[PDB]
Structures are given as C-alpha cells and as structure tokens.
Amino acid sequence: QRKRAVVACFRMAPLYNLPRHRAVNLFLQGYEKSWIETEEHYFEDKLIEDLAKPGAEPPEEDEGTKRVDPLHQLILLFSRTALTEKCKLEEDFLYMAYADIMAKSCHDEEVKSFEEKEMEKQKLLYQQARLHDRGAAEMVLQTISASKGETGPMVAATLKLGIAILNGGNSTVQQKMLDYLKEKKDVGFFQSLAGLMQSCSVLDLNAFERQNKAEGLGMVTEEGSGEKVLQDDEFTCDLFRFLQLLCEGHNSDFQNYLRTQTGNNTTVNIIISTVDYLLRVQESISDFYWYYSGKDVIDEQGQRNFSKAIQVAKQVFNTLTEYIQGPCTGNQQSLAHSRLWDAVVGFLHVFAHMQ
Amino acid sequence: ILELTEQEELLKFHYHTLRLYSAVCALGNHRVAHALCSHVDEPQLLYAIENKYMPGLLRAGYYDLLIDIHLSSYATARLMMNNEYIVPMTEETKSITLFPDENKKHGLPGIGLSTSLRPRMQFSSPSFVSISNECYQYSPEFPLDILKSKTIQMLTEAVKEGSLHARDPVGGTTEFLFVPLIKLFYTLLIMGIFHNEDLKHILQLIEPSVFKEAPKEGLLQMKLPEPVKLQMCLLLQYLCDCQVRHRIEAIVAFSDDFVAKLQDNQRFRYNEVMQALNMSAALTARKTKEFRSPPQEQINMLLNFKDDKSECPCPEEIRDQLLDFHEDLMTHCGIEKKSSTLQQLISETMVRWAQESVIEDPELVRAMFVLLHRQYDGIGGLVRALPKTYTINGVSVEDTINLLASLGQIRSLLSVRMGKEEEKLMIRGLGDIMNNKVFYQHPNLMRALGMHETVMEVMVNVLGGGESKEITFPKMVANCCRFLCYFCRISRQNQKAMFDHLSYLLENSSVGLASPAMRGSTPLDVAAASVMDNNELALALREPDLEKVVRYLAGCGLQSCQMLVSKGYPDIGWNPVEGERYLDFLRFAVFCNGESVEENANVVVRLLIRRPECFGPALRGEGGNGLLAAMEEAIKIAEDPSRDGPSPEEDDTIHMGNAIMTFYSALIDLLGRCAPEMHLIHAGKGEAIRIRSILRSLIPLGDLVGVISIAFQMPTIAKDGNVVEPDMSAGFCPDHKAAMVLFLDRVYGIEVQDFLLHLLEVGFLPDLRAAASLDTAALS
Amino acid sequence: GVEIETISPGDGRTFPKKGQTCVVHYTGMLQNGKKFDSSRDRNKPFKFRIGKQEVIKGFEEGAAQMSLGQRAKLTCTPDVAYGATGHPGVIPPNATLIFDVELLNLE
Amino acid sequence: MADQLTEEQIAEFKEAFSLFDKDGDGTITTKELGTVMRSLGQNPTEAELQDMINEVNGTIDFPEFLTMMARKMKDTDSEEEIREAFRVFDKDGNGYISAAELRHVMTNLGEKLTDEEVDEMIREADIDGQVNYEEFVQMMTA
Amino acid sequence: ECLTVPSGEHGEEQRRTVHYEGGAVSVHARSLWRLETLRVAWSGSHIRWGQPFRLRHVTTGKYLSLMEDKNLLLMDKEKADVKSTAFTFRSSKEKLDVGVRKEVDGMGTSEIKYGDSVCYIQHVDTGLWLTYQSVDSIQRKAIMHHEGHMDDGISLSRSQHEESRTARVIRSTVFLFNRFIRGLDALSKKAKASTVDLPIESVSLSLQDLIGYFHPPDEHLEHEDKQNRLRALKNRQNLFQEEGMINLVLECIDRLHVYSSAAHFADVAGREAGESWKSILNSLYELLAALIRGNRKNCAQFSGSLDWLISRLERLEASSGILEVLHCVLVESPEALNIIKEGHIKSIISLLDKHGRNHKVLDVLCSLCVCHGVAVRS
Asked: What is the CATH number of the domain that holds D100?
C-alpha cells in the first residue's frame, strides 16, 4: 500500500552515508553468511580413520584385554547417554556434531566401469563397517528409542547416521539392528517410530495462504525458503528411507517384525502407521491441488511445494513397496485391510486431473 | 594442623567445615565472604597454599576456599561474557593483525594486545573496624601478584616432582597435588591476571616444545590422572578461546579499513553516475538499484567476491584485499613432523590420551571429544562467535561498560533464589539499562547479548516460585514486563524475537490481570506488545495460540474471581475485569495498522461463536437482557455503593459497574474490528459476507443505538465555585461509546438518510450539545 | 568508655587533630583472646579521617588519644563497639573488643 | 518505533534529559519537562503540554519520554526533502519529465512481481506524460 | 479412561465405589484389577467369551459385585459370593446367550486378545451390561444398565509383573501397618497388652523386606542393568507414593514416638515388643529415606511434613534417621528448601551443640545453602 512505497525510497540512506561503526557491524554479519558459512572443508573421513586407529596398543605392555579405540569410546559414551533414563532426550552438541561426522565419513560423495562400481561398493562396506563394528548400529536404535516420539535435531542426525550405515541394504547392519531389538525387547523403539510418524508434517494450506498474502502485500520474507509449509520434508524423507533400508533386499525378518513384534509385551504396526501417513499426505496433496485448480498458472512458491510433497509421497510409496516386495503375506494382507485404497483412489484423481 | 594426618575424625570434620565455609559464600555472597575473612585469614590462606605436609583433603578444601572467597565472583563474571565480543572502534584496535610479522606463524595464545570490552575487576578491603556499608559489594581483596608468583613456583615444582614419579606427592596423591593447584592456576588464567612474561613461562610448563618462542616434558606429557586431564582440557579450551578472540578482533581491525574503502568506492560510483546519467538512461536504471536497496542488502551483494558469478560492482583492487585477508584468516584457522601449533598439539594429545587407556569418566570423554571437534572445526568457531560481535565507537565505550556491568549483575541473580534483597538489585539493574542510551542506540547489541531471554528466564523463575500459591514478588513481574514491552517498542526485530516466546506468555497469561494498577506490566501485555502494529507477526499467528485466549475468556465469563470475592466484591458468575484484558489481546491480534487481519478475525469470530460464554452473561441468548439493558444495569451498579465496591483509589477499589461497562465496550470493539473491510464486501466475498452477517446478528442495531443514546454526567459547580466532577473510573465514560460507533460503522454501516438522521437526533446531538456547553472557563 | 595501655611509647608530642587522616596498623581480638581482624594480616596500613564517623566509637577515641609513633592497647566496650546487635557473622552480641593499635603516620 | 529516530539525534535528547539526571524519575515533573523542549527550541502550546502528559503522575521516565516525543517530532520532514526532489534526475533544464526516467520507480522493494507498474499509469489521473516531482508522490494518498 | 476406585481419602466406605478416571491413574496401582476364574484346576487357562470370572481390586483386596439395589460396590472376600461376584466377557451386545459349554482341561483356545479385542462386561446372573452414568478429574460413575450405551466397549491392557507385585505388596504392607497402628492406639487407650495384638515380628520382617525392596543399585553393575534397576526403583517409589504409603509410615513413626524410651514402651507393651522398639524406629526411618531418595516428586510431596520431621531431631533415638531423611529431601526438592526457616536452621545448628561434631549436620547445612546450582541467600 501507501506506507511501503513512500518511506523506503527517501528515508533510505546509502551505505556510504552511514556511520563507520554501523557499516562495520553490517559487514561483520554479511561477511559471515557470505564467506564463513560458505566455506566447506572435508575432514570427516580422515578424522574417523584417525579415531579408529589403535595407537600402539599391542606394542604397549598392558598385559590385559584389547582396549577400545577412541571411536569405540565415543560410540559407547553416546550409547550410554541414550541408555540412561531421562524425561526427555536432551539436546547434545557433541552427539549432533559426531553423528554428522560419522555419517559423512561413510559416503565420500560418465557411466563408471564395473570395476569402479565394485570399488565404490567395497569402500562403502568398509566405511560402514568402521562404524557398525564399534557399536554404532545399536546406538542409533537407542537414540531413537530414547527420543520418545519427539521430532528434533537429535533425531534428525540419528536417522541420517542410520541411513549412512544402512546404505546399499547392508545385511550385516540389518542383522545387528534386528538382533539388538529382539534381545532387548525394546518396545520404546517402535513406540517412538509411531510417535515420529504421527508428528511428521504435511502440506499446510492455511499457512501457505498466509505466507502468500504476506509476500504479496509487500511484507519482507523473514525466512529464505518459507519452510513453514511442509515443515520438515527432509526429516520425513529420512525417517521413511531408514525404514526402507531396514527392509531392503527382501529382508523377510524385518518385513515381519515391523508389522508384529512376537517377543514384545505390546506391538505397534509400523506398516499401518506408514499407510496412515500416506493417507494424510494424500489428503494434503489433494487439497493443495484443489487450491490451484481454478488458477491458470502455478507460481514457483507453489511448484516447489508440490515438489516437496511429491518427493515425500514417492519416498512413502517406495517404503510401502519395500514392505511387501517378495512374498510377504502378512504385510500384503495388512495393507489390504487398511486405508491404502482410500489413498490410492485420491492419488488417481490427482493424477488424472493434474496430468 | 599437620597432626590431622593421623586423626581421621577431626580431619573429616574440618574438611566438611571447609566445605560449609565454601558453601555459605557460594555464588557471589560477598557479605559472607567478608565475614569468612575473620575466620580464615590471608596468612592462613597462604600457609595452607604453600605447605607440603598438609593433608590432601585439607589442601583441596583450602584451595577451594581461597577461590570461593576471593576469586570466584570475577571469574564467573568474566566467563559469562567470554562468549561475547564487543570490540571498540579505536586506534589501538585498528593496529591488530592476525599474525605478528611476515612469517605467518601463530603467536603464543594469550600474549598480545586485545581491545575487546571486559568486565571490570574491583575488590573491597576487608575491615571490621570500619562502619561503612559500601564494602559488602565486590569480593574481598587478595594479593594477586604474590598469588601469581607462588602459583607459578608451585606449578614448576610440581611438574619437576611428578616427572620423577616420587612416592610423596603433596597431599598424599597426585590427585591431591595437581588437581587443586591446576584449578587455582586455571582460575587465575580465567581472571586474566597473568600478563606477558608470566603467561610465556607458564605456556612452557603446559607444553615446552610447541610454545618454544622464536628432555623437558611439560604437563601434557606426564601420565596424568583423569581429574588432572579434565582440568588440562579445560585449560586448553580456554587457550583455544583466546585464539578465537584474537582472530575475531583481527577481523574487526581489517573491517574498519575495508568498510572505509568500500564506502569511498560506493560514493565515487554514485557520483560518477549522478554526473553521467545523461550519457545513457538505461544504465542508470540498473545502476541505482544499489542506492535504493536497504543497507544490509547493499553490502550483501557487494560481498559476492567469492565464486565466479561476479556481479558485484566492487572493483578488483578492493576485491584482492578481502580475498587475501580471507586466505590469511583460513591459514590462521588451519584450513589449508613437528606440530608447532596449539591446534595440532590438542588434536594429537586428545587422540593419544584416548588410545592409551579407556577413560572411565564420561565427563572427561565428553571434554576430550568436544575439544577435538573444536580443533577439527576451526571455521565453526567463527560462525558461532561472529554473530555475537558488535563494534562501538570510542565515545560509547564507558556507557557500554556500564550497560555490560548492569547486564552481568542481572545475569548473576539467575543462580540465586529470588527474594527481597534481589528484588531491589534487579529493579535497579533494569532501571539502569533503561536509563542507558546504548539500550536504545544499539538494539542489535542488546539482542545479541540476549537480555530479553535473561529477563524471560528471571520472570519464569519468579512465576514458578508462587504460581499456584498466589503470586509472589509482583513488583518483579511488573518491572520485567515493562522492560520487555519497552524492548518490543525499541525495534521491529526486537518485536520479532520477542514473538518467539508467545507460547509461554500465553501459558502464564492470568498472572496479574485482576490486580489494579498493574496494567502494561503483565505477561499478556508483553504478548500484546510482541504483536502490536506488526502485520507480519500478526499473520504469523497460529490458531492454537488463539484458542488459548478464547478458552481463558470463556473461563472468565463462566467463572468468578476468587481474589475479588475474597476481598468482598459481590459474587457474580463471571469476571468482567479479567475478560477485558483477554479481549484487548484479541483486539491487537485481529487489528493491525488500521486494517483488520482477515485470517485472524475470521478465526476469532468462529471461536467466540463456538464458545458463546465469551460474550458475557447478557449476550448468551437464554435469558439475556441484551446489551442496552446490560449496560443500563451497570449504570446503576456503579452508583449503588453496596454492589460496586468490596463491601467492607482505583489501585485499591475495583468499580464493578465500570468493569462491566469496559467489558461490554471491549467485546463490541473486538467484534467491530473483526468485521471485514468493505473492499471485500463490495467485491462480494462469500466468507466476508457470512462473517458480517454473523456479527450483525450477534448485536441488534437498536442495542447499539440505545447505548449511544445513553446520557452522560456533566461536572457541576458548587456554591464555592469549586469544580465537583465525578470520577471517570466510576461512571459511564465517553471512551465506552467509541466502540459502539466503530461497530455500527464497520458491521452495520450508515447508508440511508433516515437512519443517519435518526442516529444523529437520538445520540449525537445530545453529546455535542453537552460538550459545547463544557467550553466555559472552569469546565474546559 | 575506653582506657589505654600504651605498649610502646610514642613521641608524646603530636596528636591527631581535626580533619587529619590517621594511618594505623591495628589488630583486634575478642575478650577471650580470639582474633577477628588484623591489618597486619592483610599487610596494609589502615587509614581513616578522624572525628568523621568512619570507624567505631571506641577505635575513634583510642586513636584520638593516641600519639604519633606509639603502640597501644584499646579496650572498647559494647556501647562504643557494635552495641548489642553485634557484627553479623563476626562479632557476637554484647562483646568487648580489644585492639592492638599503632599510629604509623598522621596525614 | 526507533526507525523514525536516528542514533545521531537521539543523543541530544539524552543530554537534555540528563540535565535533571537523578535516575530520571526525580525532579522530572510537568513543569520540568516543559523546559527540556526549551533547550531544543520548539515552543509547544500550553494545551500541548498536558495533552501529551496524560496520553502516557508528573514523573516521566526516559522510556516514556522517548516514546512520547518520538511520534510528534516526525515533522517538518519536507524542509530537507524539497531539495531532494530536483536532484534525483532530469538536470537537463528543459523542464519536461520523461516517462523513461519513471522506470526507476517501479522497482519492487520486496515484491519482485511485475505488471502492477502499468497500473501506476492507470491510477494517475490525466487531469490538467507530464507529472510534477513532488506531485507524483502526493495526490494518491489523503 | 480406566475403571478404578477413589483414591486414599482415608475412607474405605467411599473407596468401595467404582468409576471411570483418566490421566495419571493409568500408571497407578488403584486402577489394577485381577481376573480370577471360578475354577481351581486350570485357572491359568485362556479366558474365553462367556467364561465366568471374578474381578478383584489389587490394592484393596475387594471384589467387584452387584448390590441388591443394582449398584456396583467393592466388598470383602468373606462376603464375595459367586451370585454377586461373577462377570463375563462377550464379543457383542447380542441378546443370544453363550449357553452351557463343556469345561476344557488345558490351556484352551486363545480367544480374547489384549487391546485389539473389544470386551463387554456383563453380570452373569442379572445379565446387565456395565455402562457409565454419563453424568458428573472425570469421576464418570460406572453403573449397571439393561442395555447400556453404544460406547460400552472396554479393551484390556496387561499389567507388568513388577507392577502387579508392587501393587500386591502395597496391600500386604498397608494391612499389617494398619493392624500395628490399631494396636498402638488400643495401647494408648489402655487396652490390656495380652488382649491387644501387636504384630512386631511380622513388622520387623516386613520393614527389612521393604528396605531390601528399596535398595539402590550397587556400583559394580553394568550400565544397562543399573539403569533398569533404577527404573524399577523409581516405579516402586511412585506406586507407593500414589497409595499414600508415605503418610502411613509417618503415622507409624508418630505413634511410636509417643514413648520416650524402650523402657517406657515396654511398660505399656510387652518386652518382646520392648527390645524391638529402637530397631523398628530405625527401620521406619530407613524406609522413609529409601521411599524418597532420588524421587523429586516424593521429596516435593514431603515439604508439608518437613516441619513435623525436624520437631523430633533433638531426640537421640531419632536424630540419625531424621537427619538422613532431611538430607535426602533437601538434596532433591528445591520446593522443600523454601520451607526451612530460621527456627529450623537454629535447631539443626543446636544439634551440633548438643550432639557433638557430626559431619552429616554440616552436609545438611551445605545442602541448605545451594540446591541444583541455585544459592539461597537467606
């Protein structure tokens, strides 16, 4: 309106008219974001290699058992912190940093040769073994269990570390993860998974309309990417990719344990929870289409929102496919008696009209 | 006292007595610290420091007592600002460089010229013959040069003794020999008493080879116990913080000249277009965007030196200065056989310690690994410290020091239980900050220091201590809420940051709503000031925050006020006093900059119609007399003294007629401000028409006309000639009729001459005729 | 309300006069013999301007009756030393204070 | 709002208020605050004294003092602005305002969305291509 | 919501009622019911639809029953009849009867599943369906109706073994302690010592068993086992707190402090009672300290009784235990540190004067100064 146009142009003073200290203060905050935040150096693979090295321990005259190397000590500390009972999973700088360091240590990332691809697979396996041989596979389960269904950066790093150690459908890590759960009878792990699914966000049409009005009327976009509609798409994608990795390779044991837990006191149906979230995200996508149906052109703010929603929907569909691929009659018949059809019938309408 | 090595009961009792001495003066109890100087003297607290035959428990108790009495307050005050960098813009500051000379080799950490503002170190002389009351501020004084010399000598001797692995450590164990002595050294280094040669000498004891300024094994290579290792990790972390501070001062030193050159270049580039725009009009259009862009964006797009996309207008000779400074800074941070650097030394020591043995202390493991992470992430320290950096000119240095002292005093009572003696201190601290001009000049510095969060936490503690058991320290809540409201009124970004605490402020929103004269000093008032006249913040409001206020207002309109009925006010079935305050916040939420927020008004109206108890007992519908009959009952209650008072001025007596009138002037004010703007109704929006229809059905037109037609009370002249004017806050007010006009205009509207003339003749002519007669000399 | 043993004689010729800073080096002990204050412990001469309500009554009068360079013992009754309330945490209520005072300089 | 004020001028309002010092509350009354405007120079009417006092006791604190005179000193702002009108463009002296020079105006300051600039011709009434410097920003509001 | 009985309002007369309550009751012990089949052999078999059974309230030892006036009311074992105490689980509200089914001899067929299955409680004889009154935490009264309402489905959640054992220990301890309190009251009212029964060997054994039960884990255990044992201890402490079993120990201590010494106790009581008086006082104080050690909620609920505890600190027979309880409360609850006043601090200080040099008094004084990093200046 009237206020915005007139006061900016004339009351606005160029940078050279500002006092020196104010301009220096502006520079100190601009320089950070432009250079310091945009400076990247890769040290994770060397740090972890150095941390996993037993330093002169066999040469040391210990006359005792094999000492745990610094990486093992770090993983044991992080696992003990999670295993300690608390009301809430407390925010941890050290865990957040190191769960990213060890996650980045396992990936190191026209048609490559077969030898090159097998080189990359063997290196992947060795890098994942560097971690899951020191107890990292049981630590990511304990952290998720201690999360108690609360979304946060503490879980957003645990789920990425689990993905890093499970990439490629690692059968050894899958077996370790299943053995730990079956031995400890951890109901909290599945309860926290159900809670995280229930806390996963979807498309918010009201928030989108409010943001669109705010941008259109001229009020400054406070955040860079408008990450209030579909609040955490990356977290949801990681959460469902973790579950897909848990069953990749037609793992009939996880495929049956995620549905029913035989040894546990109580059972949570992750298969049904996944399809419930799929139905919710379908109901969000359908409404977000219905908003744009009358409009001729979809703007970029809408196009990127559709992209973020479709990525999540694709990941959930892939996870559901991995739940049932191979003969898995329990999972197939559990999805056959759920609200899966109510989501497919709406996705079909969206596909028929939007296409 | 050396006979206690064989008497284990007196030894234990005296150790616990020393612990009680340390506890009674804990966390800045200076009055008790001065009193403890009469029981443990300085000669005693030097003899126990230096004695080698003392029991280990007594040695550790006495090192802890010395620090707690004398060196615990300033060390904590300095640690609370160790993560904050306020670098004055001075000539000595401008002379700081990253490296001492052309040879880009790191200097010894700590040694150098540092100009960042620092907490003041002041001590009071203990004396029990003086009768002054000014000595109970500041810790008791101690000889800090004798303490430095003794600490250095003892640390050297302990290093020499431990390397030989003797069977007689001081105190009986290496733990009793090193842990408390290293704690004292660490406290002294934290306080910063060591200077130049002393720090150079002690860095050689820490690591003789790395700190060899240009056989003997320092503390880092001594096969230390785990508690010793923990304190060495703390010392190394402080050493790293010293390097971070030097790196972050050297950035400001370069930034002065860089910003000067950038501003000169921008002025030159502006003039070179101002005198040459007639050459080409097209180029000026895309050249004046920088001069019309906000100052932050100007420098953000001037700082695109990196990469090769290179659309910044800054020339190459200014490019290659920042490009070289950044490379030198990365070299300093370590981002490219002998370590020759603190970073490499720590990175080696931590790994070597972890691989020599299994550490049994989780705290030691955590401290070891958080230090290794710091060493391997040198760029991650700058990204955390630079936001906490603010530069001030030379004239403001003393004022900023005073503000920082007041803030440190405010911060220091976050670790004490709030009481009468703390109420005065912090009211004084808040008042000094308010009377401090930097608080207004530099809101960004204030926000970076996070005083709003500190006051938030203090008021949280006060509310927790006395929420269910009636509010304690209401003057604290009042001062804290006034401070936070002024903080919102300072700047728009302050209001945005204060908006982030809306959830808690709505949680504790009934703190002092019914307390008279405590208006503008309530967490609900802070919540309202966090969204007042901010369109972006009002549109950022969520519904869950909105149902909370509606629930509270429904509870108020359904429930009576225990405190008022306990003071004796007549027990009606609702809360007119508390309801108006909840209605005011909704007013501020739905109305912004003279226009209704269409995404909040439509939610508020729906919530209020879902909960019809929010409309007051007279607009329920079942048995309600309406609105005109509702505010004519109040215009009789306010005159009946047995129904308007507590039945045995305004701060002590709530007027029960004026409260109902204010409630029924705030509800209609909110409902009229929730009416849609007429451009939407003219365009024919169905939701806007529906909302207007609901609002119009809620209040009849006659109930609005009658209230306007209600007469006023004119002041009268007595036989003396003195003006006998009835109290404003006890009767029907003109401000109470301002809501009826707004509602009748925004919801009903005036569109027909007949109704316009009717409304005039019945309600406006009496008011104008009674006001034009008040234009006399005394009644003006 | 305070008498005075001299412990070491002074000049006997110069006495503190009004508005003059008195520099003393004192040690104060309770009646039972327990020390509670000593400027010698802090290694610092104690300075106070006479007649000016900076120190307690008894110390004030004892230093006034003192001569330059003298060493004397001051006995302060409770009425002229902290009264019946006492000094919190240091001096018990109704305590007689004994001071070992030396007047180093007058300024 | 501190955007209307500047760190430069906000100083003088402090030393003027520091003339009575003593933590602000003391000796700052209705008559006392009537004297601080006398240091600045502006000469408010007697009605203009208590009409503002009651809008926010006698004792006026500095945050109250700043929040008061902030709203009323946003004034005489065209005394410097009138110089700015003829300096931004069109120094050729012919006195004909070109439409091409008007293209610097549309530049959305936070919107980055076009085709409403064309409406800026539409809302400009052709009442006698030529639009005066001060007038182009004036008739649209109030 | 959970079908439970009123909390410890000191009256079994109104605790004998049932209702629906939600919130934190679902993890308490008064919402626990034991299903007892009407057969002695194969009583641990799978419960089938239409199988008669009794419902027992664990913390009260009383059975769900239907009154003459068609009311739900808990009553005692000696009065619990099959005619009054008999309920069945049926799949639906169908009016068809289950009929006479032959009694199996074995585990049987798994019919009712925990949680997933939906059960409907119906009286065996009257055939009435168990429904709520639907009118006024919640206090939704549970009554008996001819057909009930449509939302009358009840699922089943199986209690943990530790939870059930703690719930039964609660009853077994409260019964004995009530007997002991009644005996002490009779002795105070001057009943003959032989006529009145004082359970004192049973009380000593129970007080030893309870302290063994509330034993903090030893430091040699592995981390996971230690944390599991800490969790079990926390659950036991919470369950005993929610049943008002702290106040029962307090009542026992208060009623046993009416006697100055062992001889004074043995004058009114016997001597097999007499030599077991100091031991019972010490065991009660140790149990009180164990029921609250490490539990912030238990220590915070003790703030009101903190004043009463300090009133007996000067007693020689109670000083050590009272000081231990005081230290346990102060180290945990910031809220109980606000209750301590000048008189309490002076009493603790005079304890040093009258008892000697005890470092445990200095420890309590240290705890009085700083709690959880917050210093109390007063």
From this structure: 1.10.238.10
